[model samples]
Target chain A: TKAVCVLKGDGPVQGIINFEQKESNGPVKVWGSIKGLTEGLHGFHVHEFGDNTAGCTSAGPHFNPLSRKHGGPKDEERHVGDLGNVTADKDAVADVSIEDSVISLSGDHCIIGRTLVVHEKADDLGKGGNEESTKTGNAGSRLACGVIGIAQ
Target chain B: ATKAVCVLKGDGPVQGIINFEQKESNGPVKVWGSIKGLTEGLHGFHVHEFGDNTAGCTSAGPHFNPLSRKHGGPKDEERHVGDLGNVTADKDAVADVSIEDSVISLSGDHCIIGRTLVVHEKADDLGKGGNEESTKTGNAGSRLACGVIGIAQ
Candidate 1:
C-alpha cells in the first residue's frame, strides 16, 4: 500500500513524498526527495489538518494525537508528528527514507487525511530549552506544505 | 437519490453549496444551489477539469471540455461538459436557483464526482459575444469561488 504527498509553495519547490508499507504488520517506510530548499537541515513534521484554506498555516498545529511534548523521532518523549530533520544537499535537494514506528497507513496512527509541512529552519528537537521548543521546535516559516492522500 | 454535492470556497467570509440529484431514468440531472456574498448580478458557473485543491481554484485547471467542443450555452448541443450557464444573485447578494441538465452525469467520462466546480466574477456571454475570447471561455472573468464535487451520502 502507498500514500502520496504533493508539496507546493511559492518558490521553485515541488516534491512527492511517498509512504510505503510492504506488509500489513511492518513499519511504514517514509521516503521522499524534495528540491528547492537551502543547504543544511530543515524542520519536518506532519500536521493535524489537511485543510489548506490559508496555505500551510491553515493546516493547523503538528499532528500530536496523544497531546505530548515535541521531540525527535528517537527521543523517549516525542510527538507522533515529529520525524526530525531532513538534510538538504548543496543542490537544494533533500532525500529521506526513514523507518517510523508511530506512523502507519492504517489503524489509529494512520497519517491519511492529514498534512505535511517543511519548515524554513531546522527543528531544535525540543532540546532548545525554550517555550516555543515544545510547541513548535522554534522552526521558522513554513516553506512548503502538502496533503497526504491514499494512493492506488 | 442525491448523487453529488460541492461546497464552494473563496477568500471571502461566505461560502456556497451546490447539490446534484437524479430524478429521471438515464435523463437529465437536477441541480440546486445557493451562493451568498456575490455581486447582485449573473456569475459564470462551470465544472473544472481536476479535483485537486492543493493550490486552491487555480489548480483545478481549465473547463471540463472532454469532447473538445466550442464554448456555448447550457442548451447548446456543442459545449464543454462544464458549461452550466450562469447563476444570478439578487440585490441582497444571494443566489438561489434550480435546473436540470442532460449533459452532466454521475458515471463514465462525464462523471463529475472528482472534478471541480468554479464560479466566475462576470456573466458568461454563452459564446455569442462576437469576439475571439467568447469561443474559448465565454469571456468569464476571475474565479470567485471553487469546490470539488464529491459523492453524497
Candidate 2:
C-alpha cells in the first residue's frame, strides 16, 4: 500500500532533493523536495550506485557503513550515504526534510536494496579529513536518480 | 508529550511537470502526498501552521484547523483538520507517497514548527470528480520553492 516513487520533470524545473529512508536503525532521516529551482543551496545525497544510467557521473561511491573509505554527511566514520547541501531559494526552490539513520527502509540496515544519488555540487561535511578519500567533501556530479523500492 | 513520525522520501527528484496551491475552501494546505513522475518530478511542499516563530520560517496560517473539519483524505469519513491532499512526481518519475494523516502534529499541533514547504508549477486535483473542489486554491501552479522542515527531535 505504500512504497511509492515520483521524480517529475521533463520540461520545467531547477532542482533540490535531499531525501532519506531506512527509519529504524539510527541515521538516515533527512527528507527533501524543491521544484523549479536555481537560486541558492543545492547539495543533496543518497548515491552509491543503482544505475540511473550515469548522467550525474555514474552515481558512484559513498554509502560505505564502517567499511569506511570516503567521508562527509558529517564524518565520524562517514559515508553512510553522506547527505549534505541544499539551499535553493529566490525561485530556485528548496523544500527539504530530515530523519537520519544513514540510509535504510527496514531492518538488517536496509535501504530497500539501495541507491538514491543526486549531486552535481554541494556536500562539504568532511571539512578537511584528507585526500577526499573517495570524493567526500569535494561533492560534485551524479545529478539524478531514484532506486529505493518498496513504498507502502 | 513527544510523538513524531511523518515519513515520505520519494517521488520528487526534479525533471518537469508541477502542481500546488489547493486552497479548496481554505482548510489549510493539506495534500499528504501525490506521485506522477516518469521523467518529470518538480518539488517543494507544505503543511505548516505554527509551533513558534522561526523568523521567515514561522508564517503560521494554515494546518491549524482550529476545527473547521471535513473535506477530503479520500472523502473524509470525518475530515477537517486540514485534510492533507498533495504529493505528485509523475511522468515516469514515480516515488513520492504518504497519505492518511490526521491534519497536523508530528508532536504537537505545529507538526514541524515554522513549517513552510512550498514548491510548485502545477498539480492538485485531489477533488477527483470534476473541478468543483477547488474552493479557493487547487489550480496547482506557481510559487516555485520554499522550505523549513523540523519534526524529529
Candidate 3:
C-alpha cells in the first residue's frame, strides 16, 4: 500500500509525499519531495482525519489512537503518527526517506484515508518538558496538508 | 448539458466553489464563482495547465499558455488561455461574480476538463506591473486556493 500527500500553503512550495508499505506487520517506508520550506527541520506527522475541507485544520490532531504522550518515533509511549522531522536545504527543498514501525497500511494502525500535515516549526518529541510539547510538540502553523490514498 | 464545479484549497481562511456553464457548443463558457472565508479584497484567478491536484496547486503547473502568449487579462487577445482576471470579495468576505469568457470552452483544443482553477493572494496586474514577473505570472503573489476542473452531469 502507498500514501500520497500534496503540500499546500503559500509560495511555490509545491511537492509530493509518497509512502510505501509492504505486508501487514512491516514497518512503513516514507519518502517524497517537498519544496518551499524554510531551511532546517520541519514537523511532519499523520493527522487524524483525511479531511482537508478547511485546509489542514480540518485534519484534526495527530494520530494518537493509544492516548499516549507525544514522543518521537522511537519512543515507546509516542503517538502513532509521530514520524519526527524532515530537514530542508538552503534551497527550501527536502527529499525525505525514512522507515517507522508504529504505523501500518493494515490493522488498527492503517493510515489510509488519513491526513498528513507538515508544520512550520520543529516537533519537540515530548522531551522539551513543556506542556505544549506533550500536546503538539510545539509545532506552529500548518504549512501543508494532503490525504493518504492507496496508490495504484 | 452544462455547468461544472471546482473545489479550491489553500492555507488561508478561504475556500472556493466555481461553476462553468455553456449554452451552446460554440458559445462562450460562462463562469459563476462563490468564494467564502476570504479577506475583503481582489484575488487573482486563472486556470492552470494540468488537472493533477496531487501536489495541491503546485502540481498544476503555470498558467494554461498553450498559445505561447504572455499573461494578460481575460479580454486581452494575447493572453494565456487560463487568464480570467480577478474576483473581488465584498465587505463580508464573500465573492459572488459571473462572467462569460470567449477563450474557455468545453470541447475542442480549448477544452478545460482536465485542467485546474487557481485563486491567488493578490490582484493580478495583467502584465501591466512594469516587471518581468508580470508577463509570466502577473505578480499574483501566492496561490490561495485551487480546484480541478471536471465534467458535470
Candidate 4:
C-alpha cells in the first residue's frame, strides 16, 4: 500500500512525497522531489497533525504517539516522527529517498491523514547539546508541508 | 474550529479551492468553492477514499462510503458520506459550488481530512439512472480533477 503528500509552502518550496509499505508494520519508503531550499540539509519529519493553518505553525508537535523523546529516525530512543534530515542540491532541489522502519502506511501506527513537514535547517538529531535539541533536534521553521493520505 | 481545505489541480485546465467547515459537533458541513473549466452543465462531485492523484486520478478509489450505502444526493436519507451530488457550471464553464450536508463531517472519528475531492466528467444521476452503476457511482463518468483535503485555519 501507498500514501501521498503534495508539498506546499508560503514561498517557492513545493514537492510531493510518497510513502509505500509492502505489509502491515513494514518499513515505509519515503521518497519524492522537493525544490527551493538552501544548499544543504533540512529537517524532515512527520508532525502530529495535518493542520497547516497559518504557516506550518499549526501543524502541531512531532508525532510522538507513544510519548517517546526526540532523536534520529534510526535511533531506538526517539520520536516516531523523527525523520532526520534531507540534503538539497545546488539548484535548491532535494531528491528525497529515505527508508524508515519506524514509520508505517497501514495499521495502528499508520501515518495516513497526518502531516509531513520539511524544516528550514538541519535536524541535529537530538544531539545539539541543548534541551531543545532533545525535544526537536533544533530543526527550526517549517519549509513545506502536506497531508499524508492513502494511495492505490 | 473544525475546518479543512483542498486545492485542486490536475492535467486539464481544471483548478479550484474547496474549504470544508463545520460549526458544531454533528452539525452540517458547509462546502464552498469555485472550480473552473467544466462543460457548462452538471458534473458529479464527491470525496474519494484516497487523496492520491497519480495515474491520472485513477488511484483515488471509489466514493468514501464508510456506511456501505447506495449512491444518492446530498439530501438523501441514505447515501454515501462522500456524495454531495452535482455541481452546475455557468455558461463561462465555471462552477461556484455551495453545499451543506449532514453526512460529511470534519471532526472526531468521522473526520474527512486527507481525502480526495473529485469532480466527475458527467452528471451524477443520484441513483435514478435505473442501473447498477447508478447505485454504485450514480453512473458518474471519469474524473475531471482531483485534490487532497488538508487542515486549514
Q: Is the docking of candidate 1 incorrect, acceptable, medium or high quality?
A: incorrect
Quick one: best DockQ, which candidate? 4
Task: Kindly list the per-residue Cα lDDT of model 4 for residues B7-101, writing each as its tens digit.
Answer: 67654587777888899977989999899988888999999888776554677899988788888988887789889899999899899989988
Model 2 chain B: lowest-lDDT 10 consecutive positions: B14-23
Cα-based lDDT at residue B110, candidate 4? 54
- Per-residue CA lDDT of candidate 1, range A53-145, in tens? 456786778888888999998886788888888889999999988888887766657666567788899999999978899878988888887
| CAPRI docking class of candidate 4 | acceptable
Clashes of each: 0, 88, 1, 0
DockQ of each: 0.06, 0.03, 0.06, 0.37
What ranges in model 4 sit over 4 Å off? B1-43, B54-62, B65-70, B75-81, B86-113, B119-123, B129-146, B150-153
Model 4: per-residue lDDT, tens digit, A11-100?
Answer: 788888898888886788989899998999899988876665454676788888888889998899788889899899899999999999
Whichever of 3 and 4 has more TM-score, that candidate is 4
Q: Estimate each model's TM-score.
A: 0.56, 0.28, 0.54, 0.72
| Model 2 DockQ vs. reference | 0.03
Best candidate, lDDT-wise?
A: 4
Query: What shift in Å separates residue A113 of candidate 2 from its native position after superposition?
Result: 18
Residue A74 in model 2: shift from native, Å?
17
lDDT tens digits, residues B1-153, model 1? 536666677866347888888755466889897888888888889987766565567777778888999988999997898999899989888889686889988655676655678888899999898799897788888888876565443
| DockQ, cand. 3 | 0.06
